[PDB]
Design an enzyme around this catalytic site. Structure first.
Site, PDB file in Angstrom:
ATOM      1  N   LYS B 172       1.312 -16.398  10.141  1.00 37.49           N
ATOM      2  CA  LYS B 172       2.422 -16.840   9.013  1.00 37.49           C
ATOM      3  C   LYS B 172       3.620 -16.152   9.165  1.00 37.49           C
ATOM      4  CE  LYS B 172       2.930 -15.879   4.948  1.00 37.49           C
ATOM      5  NZ  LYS B 172       4.419 -15.919   4.681  1.00 37.49           N
ATOM      6  N   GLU B 246       1.829  -1.926   8.062  1.00 35.53           N
ATOM      7  CA  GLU B 246       3.130  -1.321   8.353  1.00 35.53           C
ATOM      8  C   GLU B 246       3.950  -1.726   7.103  1.00 35.53           C
ATOM      9  OE1 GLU B 246       6.277  -0.650   8.487  1.00 35.53           O
ATOM     10  OE2 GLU B 246       6.979  -1.662  10.506  1.00 35.53           O
ATOM     11  N   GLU B 378      12.924   3.503  -0.383  1.00 35.89           N
ATOM     12  CA  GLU B 378      13.647   2.803   0.733  1.00 35.89           C
ATOM     13  C   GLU B 378      14.535   1.543   0.260  1.00 35.89           C
ATOM     14  OE1 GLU B 378      10.910   0.086   3.086  1.00 35.89           O
ATOM     15  OE2 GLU B 378      11.581   0.499   4.828  1.00 35.89           O
TER      16      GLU B 378
HETATM   17  N1  LIG Z   1       9.165  -4.708   7.415  1.00 29.55           N
HETATM   18  C1  LIG Z   1       8.959  -3.928   6.438  1.00 29.55           C
HETATM   19  O1  LIG Z   1       8.062  -2.707   6.663  1.00 29.55           O
HETATM   20  C2  LIG Z   1       9.308  -3.957   5.083  1.00 29.55           C
HETATM   21  C3  LIG Z   1       9.612  -3.441   3.809  1.00 29.55           C
HETATM   22  N2  LIG Z   1      10.094  -4.229   2.766  1.00 29.55           N
HETATM   23  C4  LIG Z   1      10.633  -3.889   1.236  1.00 29.55           C
HETATM   24  O2  LIG Z   1      10.160  -4.761   0.531  1.00 29.55           O
HETATM   25  C5  LIG Z   1      11.424  -5.949   0.305  1.00 29.55           C
HETATM   26  C6  LIG Z   1      10.717  -7.375   0.904  1.00 29.55           C
HETATM   27  O3  LIG Z   1      10.913  -8.396   0.382  1.00 29.55           O
HETATM   28  P1  LIG Z   1       9.859  -9.620   0.197  1.00 29.55           P
HETATM   29  O4  LIG Z   1      10.284 -11.063   0.700  1.00 29.55           O
HETATM   30  O5  LIG Z   1       9.827  -9.688  -1.363  1.00 29.55           O
HETATM   31  O6  LIG Z   1       8.182  -9.603   0.462  1.00 29.55           O
HETATM   32  P2  LIG Z   1       7.617  -9.094   2.034  1.00 29.55           P
HETATM   33  O7  LIG Z   1       8.709  -8.301   2.417  1.00 29.55           O
HETATM   34  O8  LIG Z   1       6.387  -8.146   1.921  1.00 29.55           O
HETATM   35  O9  LIG Z   1       7.472 -10.288   2.993  1.00 29.55           O
HETATM   36  C7  LIG Z   1       6.405  -9.905   4.254  1.00 29.55           C
HETATM   37  C8  LIG Z   1       5.492 -11.113   4.509  1.00 29.55           C
HETATM   38  O10 LIG Z   1       4.584 -11.052   3.380  1.00 29.55           O
HETATM   39  C9  LIG Z   1       4.280 -12.189   3.017  1.00 29.55           C
HETATM   40  N3  LIG Z   1       3.753 -12.349   1.758  1.00 29.55           N
HETATM   41  C10 LIG Z   1       4.197 -12.041   0.389  1.00 29.55           C
HETATM   42  N4  LIG Z   1       3.192 -12.179  -0.617  1.00 29.55           N
HETATM   43  C11 LIG Z   1       2.135 -12.553   0.056  1.00 29.55           C
HETATM   44  C12 LIG Z   1       0.771 -12.752  -0.285  1.00 29.55           C
HETATM   45  N5  LIG Z   1       0.407 -12.828  -1.631  1.00 29.55           N
HETATM   46  N6  LIG Z   1      -0.072 -12.898   0.652  1.00 29.55           N
HETATM   47  C13 LIG Z   1       0.010 -13.209   1.901  1.00 29.55           C
HETATM   48  N7  LIG Z   1       1.318 -13.159   2.475  1.00 29.55           N
HETATM   49  C14 LIG Z   1       2.301 -12.657   1.462  1.00 29.55           C
HETATM   50  C15 LIG Z   1       5.848 -13.027   2.741  1.00 29.55           C
HETATM   51  O11 LIG Z   1       5.813 -14.506   2.792  1.00 29.55           O
HETATM   52  C16 LIG Z   1       6.230 -12.454   4.283  1.00 29.55           C
HETATM   53  O12 LIG Z   1       5.661 -13.320   5.246  1.00 29.55           O
HETATM   54  C17 LIG Z   1      12.482  -5.396   0.494  1.00 29.55           C
HETATM   55  O13 LIG Z   1      13.260  -4.866  -0.415  1.00 29.55           O
HETATM   56  C18 LIG Z   1      12.131  -3.898   1.240  1.00 29.55           C
HETATM   57  O14 LIG Z   1      12.807  -2.961   0.490  1.00 29.55           O
HETATM   58  C19 LIG Z   1      10.760  -5.554   3.110  1.00 29.55           C
HETATM   59  C20 LIG Z   1      10.709  -6.107   4.174  1.00 29.55           C
HETATM   60  C21 LIG Z   1      10.099  -5.460   5.044  1.00 29.55           C
END
Ligand SMILES: NC(=O)C1=CN([C@@H]2O[C@H](COP(=O)(O)OP(=O)(O)OC[C@H]3O[C@@H](n4cnc5c(N)ncnc54)[C@H](O)[C@@H]3O)[C@@H](O)[C@H]2O)C=CC1
Ligand SMILES: NC(=O)C1=CN([C@@H]2O[C@H](COP(=O)(O)OP(=O)(O)OC[C@H]3O[C@@H](n4cnc5c(N)ncnc54)[C@H](O)[C@@H]3O)[C@@H](O)[C@H]2O)C=CC1
Ligand SMILES: NC(=O)C1=CN([C@@H]2O[C@H](COP(=O)(O)OP(=O)(O)OC[C@H]3O[C@@H](n4cnc5c(N)ncnc54)[C@H](O)[C@@H]3O)[C@@H](O)[C@H]2O)C=CC1
Lengths: 474, 474, 474, 474
Positions: B172, B246, B378
């Site tokens: 996903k 991660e 972060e």
């Molecule tokens: N890549 C990394 O290590 C990241 C850390 N972050 C931190 O968090 C925030 C990220 O934004 P968001 O879109 O709110 O969440 P998310 O950043 O955790 O999005 C990551 C993935 O997880 C999925 N997801 C969210 N809830 C889920 C659930 N209940 N079950 C299964 N999958 C789920 C989303 O649809 C997406 O594909 C940013 O502020 C940043 O500070 C954000 C993005 C990436």
């Protein structure tokens, strides 16, 4: 009779509530021991944390040497250790002394050696003009939670690789079985620097929850039931703690028509019932091809029926009691629920024994179907079920349609079949034409609901390190 | 305009709810895509489960070949892939084409090679008269969850090792950035057998929850936030699912007095703001030794001020926008919180750009103190803070007093110091006199609340396997 | 048709003596090729030493990429390589094309991958205040000597791990069979920097001796006879050159009473006589249990007699000629020696084929004894002997009382026995219930007089590296 | 003193000719010892070979236990071993007891643990329907040849890995320094089964040649001169014996303008002259950049001149004698040829000391050029040369243009350069800002004419195994 906690290099009485400890061979209380208080759990974790600054920078060789001395101390005290385990667990003394003690000492010697042997990736310039190297550093404080069925042995499996890897440890033995952990505490007091090893006492809710949920504990390692595993995982999810889990099994024993039937019977007689079947690798779930089924059941029933129960300090004793009154009722219920289906036959056993102490009869149940609770859920008692099968493919799909994933065996004389079934089985371990055997060099651990992570082997040590990449620009 | 899901070898329209995908540079809607339905989520996992029977029994050579094919198909479509990522993410086109595409291709080629290079323990007689061997077998169905910062790249990092280990995958993407995933879906349709790769679309609650909760899912791999990480570990606890995590970082950039200051400024001006700072290894929190602190702030402020924002498809563009409206607001808020501290100076930036699109000015923040939220939490935006420090021991202790543990750098000309600081940093990776550089051979991943498990390297492959002990009696 | 040497990125005629190359199916001269002169040998070594300064500092990624493009080129030229190999060696075309080409392509693909996957020891502070890391650097110039039995294949086995490790190579094919190697030379000219690969033509004395004796050659890799092994070892002892040696085998095929006899017959019919038995792993020396000896001799002699000799380019041909006139005489005299023993019966074959070109009849010999030369010494021809045995221990002691240690098989349906014998056999490889099967991931190489070092597998790559400890003081 | 051979579990007098053993502090004869006869050599190899039948099939656990036992026996007799070594070699007593004894004990403890940690390839189906596993089995009989510079330590480097691998051993000490070997023989008599260890006495030609040339010996391991190496290689060429070779070095000490000069001085003073410079890792060859050249030479000269010679059993003694009269004659002649070059200056020393015993003055030679013999040939006495250089590239090329390959160091404060130069040096080991430091976990061994194969570390255990591929058809 040693009853004090070890916290920061000192032996200290718990300041929590007193709890009874039973002799399962008689049902008598051995003594009451006060639990660690909330403040004591927290002090233990804090001392471990403060000890880590220096401990986590030690060399392999220094750690290796601490572990070899710990090995020596357990070995010099083998007799006393066996006696306490037999008194606390009802293990036949001769079994505790001859089988477990040597193994416990060897775990420690093996992890001393392995401490010094950790693998990595070759260092070099994977990007032009930059040198990359890979390290294995320790995590910090580990919370270790040991079960009641092999108190000292589990203690060794949790301590040895965590220490070898350069972590500090806070160990909570089961509250049913603390006696050998508290004797180890007394003896191991001065082998490691203060706070490197802390050993507590008390129940899951009162001591276990505050321990596993401490902000400074970076890893929880557990051997116990699935519901406990489930609980520790949700309870520590808010800090993404490393978990390491061994939650039992339900080992299929696959016996084809060309098996040595006598060897199967001899094997299960021991591996179905050893430690009263309270063993995560117990030979408890037989699939027997239809050709040999009736012969196997007859011969197995007759060999199981001769298992001798008696005083644990009697050498003739092969089968000791169950761990607690509650466990005895648990195992008894499961068997009655087998009986209740109408198609499971009691070949032998199927009763609590008379007397005090928690003895259940050695039991064999035949005509158990794949979807029966007796086949699908772990009983952890002196009880073995037999299920007829027709063919290899069908029985492999049955064995693997399980939520458990820890151990298994296949009994067949054919080379090809043994390798086919071995390759396909979705279990951590598969024995061919034997069961039950473990060596310190080979990893023990599961998949699916059995858990993940390894005890023993180099893999066992690897689980308590973090792999790190350092890349130096030229 | 590719909008279909890949389920069991077929391209199908989502039967759930429509949702908007945006262009972050203009703020315009690119298209609307129907989410996968509850039923489709369940069909995908069922397809992957049924496909596992044969796929988990394939040879290393055959999976490697499939992975070389996949690499090929990405490289043949690199220009298109880079265009879709630019449109959906706001990434400068030249950056996505020249940096991201080759790395993605190489990830797949690396893992093809490593599928054939898996380590074990020497087979032999560890117990007299019994041959033990060690195997690395696949888990079953992996649910893979990718973020919106590096959509195609993270998809690769999740797809490549899981397939190389012999698992089937249900992927996903972020609902925010599905376009490369859905183009991958069309392109890679017939490379693996039906059901081995499945790609869906939809939000966390409506699609991710039923996916990671599926009883046939054995492992869940997530790059995303700490809150998402905690929720998935809670959600899958009842089935003891392997998790692979991660969850971001806060990379300390430790700059000593003897550092090359112009090389630090050159480095941070790239590594602080590349990808608009929405990078789990961004060079985002500088500790600067007191002897060079003000010169560094001076020269960094001037270099960061020149960073060029503009149309993604323009070769001069250096800084693109943030990913969404809500993430622009998050970043803005963080910056405002630092201001309101009373002791933090804005050296440059610290405002949203006027216009449509989700642009935030490249920002340097000075006088940040250890305990400030700008230092501990972060921001994941084009924002860097600078803190002065006294001595080596103080700064290492400050850096290591974090709940993050992913990546870090030290800048110093002294060999001794560089190695001492590198040994002590509690971070998955430490660079010396650079930052940011990843190669397919070297693992990337964290500790503490950054998570556990690696992406890339032999280790990222090991993570999708179970170690098995097979022991044959002679 | 291609006849030039590859030296320092250029294709050039030999300036030494012309030598004839034969088609062994007809005994005609294919063409005359001028040998490398002594000046050219010196020149190719000095070009490889000069190219090593850059080549040995390349990244694994870049070496990998060179190796994959080489693999592509061979694949692209499969037909042509197969025709030349068939013409020069008498191999039935269908076999060279269908069996050898795909393995040769795969070898190079496997080593591309393995180049990026090299193991090491965890970097760390094994001594307080000192960070040690472990590298795997190339040795330099590698002289590679290939045999006439599998010209292109052995050329691949020597080139692929030497390049993957970052060495430069100067290759000498057998003077009997240079044709695929010279086509390789043309095709591969430009894939590696100039001087990184060099290919020469000429005999052992005029070309091998100056090559392997060169002061800048750091390693010699030879597949060929024991006498050439012995000679190279003496001739390079003055400069402690690294040697790497595969010197033939005499594979014991151990058949127990419970074997699938029809499968053994099917197996030996191919594996005793594939490549006219000129193969280091040929199934050439059967030990047959007393219970089945006579049945096995009867069935095998009937199967052997149907082997179809004839034009190599005919699809029905199974057995090509021997490699030269001299080899044919050698094989012939071996068979007459057995016969002269007075206790060996010729079941089938045992003569030269009528006509020109070097065909010997497929041969089964029965009644050979443990101390007969037919049992003890390699014949390397389409000749298989059979010797009765009594018991397991006897025959394992017979098989191990040999000067060879390359390959072996055991045929038995009993799991126990299969593992006992396999554990005990003193041979680099042991197959159970098959023979001859090789894969790029698994090592091939011997002990005792067969030599040492591996071809294929990560180990094969390791042999072309030096492990280095870099210890950095804090 | 103990003078008896250990053959097949028995202590027996030599029956060959009587040889004098000297005290090199005084020139007094310590005793005379009879050599093993040719019959005794033969009888030792035969006992080892008969002992192998069972010893080669022991578990790693068992062998490790014998190794820990032997470590215990040496440790318990630490004071006596050090006395014997001191009397025999002229080593200062405090040095042998504080440095050598703990390191020897540790070698054994290390190898004990490593015996149980052998890596392999993952077992599984690399070819469909065939299960492959990799083992690591022993070779059989190893002949080990120890030098006179570190007698006991080298006996441990040879004994420990060979035994841990499951081989039997026949060790020959130097005829110059047998005393600790024959004390070990007495003490170690009953630790291993009869014939598993055998210790002989005598000269290279009378005991060496027949031992290394025996048909049952499968491997030869030598630490000694290049001449001796070249001779063992030619002499065992007819049976393709595995060889294992550590033949010395000439370690470059590369010292840049930014080095800590005082640390370089304090370092070389120890590492140039420890063991009277009779060390294969001696800090003997300085390359000193032109900026710091004159300061280093002045300061070094002054430090070297205070080295105190005196009786070995006196705490203040730092420099003992050379090992024999002939070696003193050799060292003195290497210094005379340096003086007669016309451009080397004697900074200090450069003379035989007055008195009996074989003492040479601690010597520092300056202005030596890249092509001088003093720089290109190992001297192996208390003698250090200094060569001025201009730039990094020039000195790395100078250092790599050697026929040696054992050890080296680089002294510079710059991180970049220390990594660049470490990556480029063609030496089995490179220290950075120190020299000489060895630990059990890290391999020691050369390339080029320094030889190949490793002492200590897992690598050094691997050198005494054969890797074997077992493949089981389904
Ligand atoms: N890549 C990394 O290590 C990241 C850390 N972050 C931190 O968090 C925030 C990220 O934004 P968001 O879109 O709110 O969440 P998310 O950043 O955790 O999005 C990551 C993935 O997880 C999925 N997801 C969210 N809830 C889920 C659930 N209940 N079950 C299964 N999958 C789920 C989303 O649809 C997406 O594909 C940013 O502020 C940043 O500070 C954000 C993005 C990436
Ligand atoms: N190795 C073992 O003892 C295993 C036991 N089981 C099963 O567990 C079942 C029921 O409960 P028990 O058996 O008594 O085992 P359990 O899982 O309750 O106890 C194992 C350990 O976990 C601890 N624990 C319980 N709650 C905790 C908490 N909230 N935080 C930290 N630690 C906690 C216990 O105090 C004990 O040390 C039995 O049927 C038994 O078969 C299953 C697999 C393995
Ligand atoms: N010029 C001549 O008349 C030569 C004659 N011979 C003899 O003829 C037969 C050679 O047949 P093969 O079976 O091809 O030998 P061989 O079977 O061991 O050939 C294997 C490879 O080793 C190479 N080689 C042979 N001697 C070498 C050396 N001294 N230095 C470096 N490489 C060397 C060969 O050229 C070939 O490439 C043997 O019986 C041998 O005694 C060998 C070399 C040259």
């Amino acid at each position: 009779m040693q009853h004090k906690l070890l916290i920061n290099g000192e032996l200290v009485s718990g300041e929590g509530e007193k709890q009874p400890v039973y002799n399962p061979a008689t049902g008598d209380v051995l003594l009451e021991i006060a639990e660690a208080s909330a403040e004591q759990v927290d002090a233990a974790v804090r001392a471990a944390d403060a000890a880590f600054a220096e401990w986590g920078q030690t060399t392999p060789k220094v750690r290796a040497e601490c572990l070899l001395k710990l090995a020596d101390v357990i070995e010099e005290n083998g007799q006393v250790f066996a006696e306490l385990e037999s008194r606390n667990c009802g293990k036949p003394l001769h079994s505790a002394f001859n089988d477990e003690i040597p193994a416990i000492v060897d775990v420690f010697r093996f992890f001393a050696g392995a401490a010094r042997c950790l693998n990595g990736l070759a260092a070099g310039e994977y990007l032009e003009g930059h040198t990359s190297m890979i390290r294995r550093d320790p995590l910090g404080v580990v919370a270790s939670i040991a079960p009641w069925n092999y108190p000292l042995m589990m203690a060794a499996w949790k301590l040895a690789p965590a220490l070898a890897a350069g972590n500090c440890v806070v160990l909570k033995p089961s509250e049913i079985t603390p006696l050998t952990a508290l004797k180890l505490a007394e003896l191991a007091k001065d082998i490691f620097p203060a706070g490197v090893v802390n050993i507590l006492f008390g129940r899951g809710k009162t001591v276990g929850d505050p321990l596993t949920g401490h902000p400074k504990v970076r890893m929880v390692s557990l051997t116990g039931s699935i519901a406990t595993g489930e609980h520790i995982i949700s309870h520590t999810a808010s800090s993404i703690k490393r978990t390491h889990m061994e939650l039992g099994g339900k080992a299929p024993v696959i016996v084809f028509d060309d098996a040595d039937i006598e060897a199967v019977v001899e094997g299960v007689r021991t591996f179905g019932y050893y430690n009263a079947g309270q063993d995560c690798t117990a030979a408890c779930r037989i699939y027997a091809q239809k050709g040999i089924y009736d012969t196997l059941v007859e011969k197995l029933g007759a060999a199981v029926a001769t298992l001798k129960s008696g005083a644990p300090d009697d050498e003739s004793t092969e089968l000791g009691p169950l761990s607690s009154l509650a466990h005895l009722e648990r195992v008894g219920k499961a068997v009655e629920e087998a009986k209740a289906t109408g198609h499971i036959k009691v070949i032998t056993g199927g009763e609590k024994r008379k007397g005090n102490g928690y003895y259940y009869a050695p039991t064999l149940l035949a005509g158990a179907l794949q979807d029966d609770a007796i086949v699908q859920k772990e009983v952890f008692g002196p009880v073995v079920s037999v299920t007829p099968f027709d063919n290899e493919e069908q029985v492999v799909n049955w064995a693997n349609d399980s939520q458990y994933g820890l151990a298994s065996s296949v009994w067949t004389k054919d080379v090809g079949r043994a390798h086919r079934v071995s390759a396909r089985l979705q279990y951590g371990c598969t024995w061919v034409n034997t069961h039950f055997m473990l060596v310190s060099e080979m990893p023990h651990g599961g998949q699916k609901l059995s858990g993940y992570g390894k005890d023993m082997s180099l893999y066992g040590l690897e689980d308590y390190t973090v792999v790190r990449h350092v890349m130096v620009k030229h």
